[PDB]
């Protein structure tokens, strides 16, 4: 049904530095294609078969079903049928779900790749940094970390990975958007094509008509889903490029009492789970 | 069935300050469309296909099924069929479930957005505040928090987010209500339309009649669900605007013994889980 | 089947003061409609379609199916069919499951509303009261709570909510019972109605007969379920009004060694989980 | 199938005093109707529809299906069909599953009622009694409970509830057994009845025959299930009346070293979970 | 399918004295009927309906289906059909699955009865015995249990229950084996029977032939399952009678350093979970 | 589908001495038949019914279906049909899945029998041995076990059970392999057989032809699965016989600082979970 | 559907040294065939049967279905049909899913074999090594491990197993890629073949035509899935050979303060879960 789709797609010492306020972007870019595919072939809208041939009155049920199946499997053979637009729109109308799944997988892969290998190292590094900071504060209440900060600043082995990971997703979004823009530009009449069953010995028989009629079914639904995906992706595109400006958008709090941008972001997002942080916030917020 | 819908839609150191007595509003505004969609296409009411063409007696099963499928997929093509009202009512009758799902998602998004990013900061802040208050009371039994309170009062970075989040939902409710008001105003006869299969080479044949008959099925159910949603939403609308008046509707309890409104609400809703609160309540309730 | 319904509907420091020996009433008033709806449309009784038109012999399968679907969707249009009783009984026979679900939701809502907001405050209050009582008894073994009791007695902010919550349910039961009384009073012949397919250009054709026959199917099952619900609700009605008399139906146990009614009930129902209660019961039961 | 029924019906500081060696009786009296209903409508035996009308050769598929549905829904109308036995056997053959479910619910209710309200009080009482006994024994190793025992003996507020609860079940068993005895006494030919479709304008037409034939299907299965339930219940009946004699069927163990019957039973069934009980058993078993 | 059957039937301070190396016998005697029933009506072998009537050419689909259903429900009526063997083989061919389920339940009941009531008492007794033995050994490292052993030897209230429980199962196995021996002895031609639809007013009509043909389908599968069950049960029978000789097949280990048979078995099977047992085993194994 | 088969068959103080690097052999010998059976009757390949009779043109749907069912159930009766090869190949083609399940159960039984009864004793023995060894090493850091080792060496009550258990599996593999070798040797034309419906009174009628045609369907799939199982089993056979040579393939590690083979294997496989083992390994690995 | 495939295939003191940054390769090489097989036979694309025969007009439904089934099961018999390409392409088109599952199993086996037997030994070895290193560092703060390192360097019993395990997978990938390259090279017309039903006595009849037409359906989908698998595997191939160069791609960190490659990799990947590692990293990162 539909209740089994929306309730599972969107209704369903560990730092949150992995997602970087980008988990929502991946979730909405990977679950939307799946949700649209599930609702397109649901038991409510996809009532009829995707293809329905118009066989003559002389034909029985079996011959008409054979014509239907043949014309369904003769879409790829250019020598069988003929259309003014060509076989590319028919190919797209036949293989839209598979390429939608391909785009879904292309979106899903890079975040999992980032989480699998590049997440544990920086996360353990940030636990180490926060533990050292807490120890320093406890000692002061009752300095070598700055050296680590400047050495990490001199490092260049992590920001490149982040920008590559968050540029691959933008490239995939651009490709999907331009593809859907091309797809929505179809004349919407290409589903009308003439199917001819005259292959092999069937040439001798004259009872079968030379050419048939065949219109694809459930084509407007594909167009509506495509335009919905197009508008969602064009709305979402600026978010990723806004994220890409990491160094252009905390650590300097205690005062007396380059890859550095990523570490700064991870440090400033982690203010919770430690009691001393909020106490210092209030103490040098009242003073300043 | 129906037992699998109602039992899962409504029958199915952590502060509750996230929901602010508004979790019920989101739940009833997001589960009702899903419940109605599930019951509309249940195995009890949606017995018949949404479309049933009346083919002549000469046609066999296959030709009639082809006519049915074509007219189902010819609703979008304005050049095929013709109706006095136009193709807009037919579009709505075809795509009602998808736009209902769209409204469901539009309701579901803002609460999750609020819970994902704006909830942890204020929640950790309130644990800090209550811990400081408990420490102050324990010290008194055996003052810097007021400075934090007035600094938070001078702040303006949280109330704006709350009012925007709870105004977006009101805007979406208004849009859904006006749309359903338009939809219920349909003449209920627009489902009667004339379908003609005369596209392409089928022009040569004269056996097929020029024009057919075609009435949509399961249309009154859509109207009843639409009016039910309309009445529910018009009843629910005042609740959100009542909530929006946060500063116009506790902290001053112990006595001797602007974003401030949100913090005041979160403080007054959190009186449980601490033993000293009820003891103070009784002590300066007997005295005052 | 049926095994999946009965086994899940009825076979499937925390005080129990929320339910107040009324959880059973809500459970039997909310699960019975669901159980009846599930068994009505089970794979054992709902074998046949709800509607079966009698088309002439000339018509083929497709024309008869079209007549069936049209007459199913022409029940709401008063200008199509005609019956002596009117279109109200037909409306009821078509929309019985939906209104049953509506009554189920109307029963389910008030208990959840009471549990969501009015339960935690009084429950935390009763833990506070019992903890204070236990501390007082421990001190005596090795008095300010009475002041709290009399102040709560002077309060009037909780009994009104309880009586309103347990009067709304009675009102809904009365409405459901009177509706089912009206429904069972149907002549049981209203399912016989004459359906005419003469809308639009089909006027020109003379092959179609002017008027058809159409009897609804699975109508007696609805009547039996309605009368079962009626008898269950009329039997259940006195229970709620008996509950409503809260102040007219413990705390005075230890002796030397108005909203007050609700607190008294919650106190007397909570005698378990504390060891001193039973010891005092036996000590001043032997003496008195 | 069948594997999903038997494996889930019978193969699937807390005292066990709630069940009193009667949990098996409730389980076998509540799961047997469900198991029989599930196996009756399984995908192995219930292959055919419950009703099969014999329409003439002139009728097509649709007219025969309409006759089938009408005669299925015309069983309740006494003016349509006619049988020598009457409409009561037909009513029973139509509504056997629903009344079986009704008997199942009538068996299920009283044990849950007993467990919900009358179980916690006596169970907490027995933990109190056993704790006091253990404390007394520990003190003796290194007497006020008898007063509690005699006061409970003078009480009369619990045995009445138990006997009423275990007499209601016997009454329901008697009613079910006598009903099944009546049902098995059917002539087994009442399923043969004459169905006439001559209601309304169909009177004018002469093509339809005046009277039809109609035999119910899957009727012997109902008779076999009914007789199986009858024999099971008549075998089970003496168990409940044997249980009812509670005072006529331990506490006097330690020696030097009326509702009383229920407490005595609960005490003697609880000898486990305490180490001193078995030690005393052996010590004054060797001596006596 | 089949993967859902085998993986769930056989692939799917607490002493193990309950099973007494007999859990396997109960498991294989209760899961085999269920497995065979599930595989008999699987979606691979039970492709065809159990009954297929041969109606004449004049009959349409509906009349043939009515004949099929009638002859399916006319097997019990001896006056309708006639066969040389009689109606007993037809009864068996119709009700084989139900009696197989009955045998499955008859096997399942006695082990659960033994585990429910007779298991906890002896199990708690054996924990008491092993704890006393461990305490005695600890005291010796740094005698009243023998009195308990001889008193239990003088007792006769447990061995009788065990032998009755393990003789009831043998009786049920004997009954099932002799029944399957009778069933496999069928001539395998009894499924050929002549069905006549001439009941009631249908006597007047002459179009229907006087007598029909009707052969049951999926009958050889039942015979193969019956013979498989027969061979399994005849192979399994000696195991139970071998078990019954409990006193004829440990405690005398430490040395210086009648119901008694059951306690001896339970003691000797429980050598694990205690460290001193294996140490004593090696110490007086080296010496003796 | 297929995703539900492969993901659940192969993708889905406790010593591992039970399996002895033979758990994989049992898993691949018990899950392969189940996987092959599941994929054979999947919703992708088993599209068509196993049997398809060629009835004449005069026959309608019902007579052809009756012929199909009869010939499906007339395979066992040798007097009905006739084939040059005989009824044995037809029996095998009909009952291949059941005998495959039988082989699966025959493989599954012996490992479970070994794990149920013979595993706990030796496993507890090995915990005792390793605990004694650890205690001896701790005492040495700050000898009676050798006596236990030689007494176990003199014992002969466990190796026989192991060799019998791992020879029964080899015997079953040999039987399955030779059976599949016979089955693959079928002429593959035995599925062509002549079916005659002339039993009983149908002899009088002359419309039915004397002999029919009937070819089994989904027979090549069975042959391919059989040859796959054959090659897998012939490849797997040497593994079991390699395992059987237990005494011909550790304990002598510490040095200064017959059933014995099984205990030696269990000891040498258990080097983990104890810290002293690896330390000794390195200490007398550097020295030797 | 499709939502049940992608969400479960890719969306769904313990060291991670088992996977060695190769878990992703196994996951994508084992889940892709399963995902493609599931989507190929989904309820959206696999609408039509794989085979559709074109029977003449004289044939009824049953004869056409028999022809369909026969030609489906006559693909293997070379003497029945005839095609210019041969029976090999038809064999491949019939058995593509089974060989895809075979390749999936061939990929799945080696990683599980490596994890089952070769993982625990080296993993326990690495816990021992890291514990010894931590103890050495703690002693230094308040050397025999190097001897273990050089002895392991002299060992040659583990690198061979790793290279064999990661070369078997490469061999299987090469075989799958070359097979798919052959399969995609099919002329795509081989699905056109002539089927003749003239086996056995059917030779006498002349009504059946000598030769038929038969085109396979859902063949282009197989080609697209094959080419997708081909491109994925050819892209993935260099990853495995890059991994194979283990010795050519840490331990030397503390300084004053051959199978060796695998141990070095496992050591350098395990820097987390120990506090001293990061502290040493910063200390001799600032100095060097």
Structure overview:
- Seven copies of one chain form a homoheptamer.
- Chain A has 288 residues and is an all-alpha fold.
- Chain A has one domain (3-286).
- The first copy, chain A, has nine helices and three strands.
- In chain A, strands 1-3-2 form a three-stranded antiparallel beta sheet.
- In chain A, α2 runs antiparallel to α4 (87-141), α2 (23-40) packs antiparallel against α7 and α6 runs antiparallel to α7.
- The longest helix of chain A has 55 residues, at 87-141.
- The two termini of chain A are 58 Å apart.
- Chains in contact: A-B, A-G, B-C, C-D, D-E, E-F, F-G.
- Chains A and B meet through α1, α3 and α9 of A and α1, α2, α3, α4 and α5 of B.
Q: What global shape of chain A is seen?
A: elongated
The assembly state of the depicted protein chains is homoheptamer
Structural class of chain A: mainly alpha
Distance between the termini of chain A: 58 Å
Q: Encode the helix/strand succession of chain A as letters.
A: HHEHHHHEEHHH
Percent of sequence in beta strands of chain A: under 5%
What's the number of helices of chain A?
Answer: 9
Transmembrane segments (chains A, B, C, D, E, F, G): 28-48, 94-114, 167-187, 216-236
Glycosylation sites (chains A, B, C, D, E, F, G): 204
Membrane topology (chains A, B, C, D, E, F, G): Multi-pass membrane protein
Modified residues (S-nitrosocysteine) (chains A, B, C, D, E, F, G): 27, 279
């Amino acid at each position: 049904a539909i209740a089994q789709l929306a309730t599972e797609y969107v209704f369903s010492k560990g730092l949150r530095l992995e997602l970087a306020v980008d988990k929502m972007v991946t979730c909405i870019a990977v679950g939307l294609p799946l949700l649209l595919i599930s609702l397109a072939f649901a038991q409510e809208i996809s009532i009829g078969t995707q293809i329905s041939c118009f066989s003559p009155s002389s034909f029985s049920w079996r011959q008409a079903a054979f014509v239907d199946s043949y014309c369904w499997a003769a879409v790829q053979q250019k020598n069988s049928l003929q259309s003014e637009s060509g076989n590319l729109p028919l190919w797209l109308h036949k293989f839209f779900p598979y390429i939608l799944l391909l785009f879904a997988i292309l979106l899903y892969l890079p975040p999992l790749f980032w989480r699998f290998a590049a997440a544990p190292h920086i996360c353990s590094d940030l636990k180490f940094i926060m533990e050292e900071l807490d120890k320093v504060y406890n000692r002061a209440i009752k300095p070598i970390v700055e050296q680590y900060l400047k050495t990490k600043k001199n490092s260049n082995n992590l920001i490149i990975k982040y920008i590559s990971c968050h540029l691959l997703t933008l490239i995939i979004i651009l490709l999907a958007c331009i593809y859907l823009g091309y797809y929505f530009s179809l004349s919407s009449l290409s589903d009308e094509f003439v199917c001819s069953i005259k292959s092999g010995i069937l040439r001798n028989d004259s009872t079968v008509p030379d050419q048939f009629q065949c219109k694809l079914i459930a084509v407007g639904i594909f167009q509506l889903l495509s335009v919905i995906n197009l508008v969602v992706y064009v709305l979402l595109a600026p978010v990723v490029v806004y994220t890409l400006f990491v160094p252009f958008r905390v650590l300097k709090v205690y005062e007396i009492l380059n890859d550095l941008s990523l570490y700064n972001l991870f440090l400033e997002e982690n203010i919770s789970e430690v009691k001393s942080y909020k106490c210092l916030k209030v103490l040098e917020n009242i003073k300043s």
